[PDB]
């Protein structure tokens, strides 16, 4: 009837260390965010950073 999916059993304070590291050192955190579709996480981080930077990636 009622379900409670308790979580935290793997929890790592990912963005807590993200604050102390810079963007490049922050990139491996994203690859370890989803351990199934890793480079898709890389895609989200790279798009976000270069969106702030007002710089677009080359077509290649």
């Amino acid at each position: 009837r009622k379900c409670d999916p308790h979580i935290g059993l793997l929890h790592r304070g990912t963005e807590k260390l993200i604050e102390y590291k810079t963007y490049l050192q922050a990139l491996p955190y994203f690859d370890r965010l989803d351990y199934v579709s890793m480079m898709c996480n890389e895609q989200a981080y790279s798009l976000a950073v270069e969106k702030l930077l007002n710089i677009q990636p080359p077509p290649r």
């Binding site: 590291k21 490049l24 050192q25 922050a26 990139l27 491996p28 955190y29």
Partner: protein, 176 residues
């Protein structure tokens, strides 16, 4: 553009119901499943015979840090410490000191194997291609201590491999 998936309609005619009734009674899609596995039984396996057969890799493989040396003999690391600053896990511990000759040389170069992540950032850091990730993965250990590498182990790893990693960066520095 888009496309449905579960929009097939079952036909109510005498023919169509017969196949469905035959499928339910005489299990055919189950037998179809059986045929798929059986055809795979007669399919050759793809089991690499470790250790005698070893999986393929690429000249860019990252693992088992090892300081290199110049063709003269002097080690590459000038203690520029970009690897230390870059290292996203802070596994690198470098302390510099002016050597008796005058040029720098790290008196302490410990990279903690169980803090490192083998991201390959450290080779991209030092402009003298001092530290690189070699092709080794066969350094599993039984005590946590031997994983904690130091300058002496790093140099010994470099002298041990060197030649293998000498060609690796020769076939990859064009890409970099």
């Amino acid at each position: 553009t888009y496309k449905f998936v579960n929009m097939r309609e079952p036909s109510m005619d005498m023919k169509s119901v017969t196949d469905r009734a035959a499928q339910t009674l005489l299990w055919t899609e189950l037998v179809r499943g059986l045929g798929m596995t059986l055809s795979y039984l007669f399919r050759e396996p793809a089991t690499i015979n470790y250790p005698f057969e070893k999986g393929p890799l690429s000249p860019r493989f990252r693992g088992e840090h090892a300081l290199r040396r110049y063709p003269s003999g002097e080690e590459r690391c000038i203690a520029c410490k970009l690897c230390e600053a870059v290292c996203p896990a802070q596994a690198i511990t470098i302390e510099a000191e002016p050597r008796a000759d005058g040029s720098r040389r790290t008196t302490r170069y410990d990279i903690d194997m169980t803090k490192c992540i083998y991201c390959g950032f450290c080779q991209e850091a030092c402009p003298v291609d001092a530290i690189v990730e070699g092709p080794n993965f066969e350094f599993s250990t039984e005590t946590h201590e031997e994983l904690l590498y130091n300058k002496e182990k790093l140099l010994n790893n470099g002298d041990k491999w060197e030649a293998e990693i000498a060609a690796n960066i020769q076939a990859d520095y064009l890409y970099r």
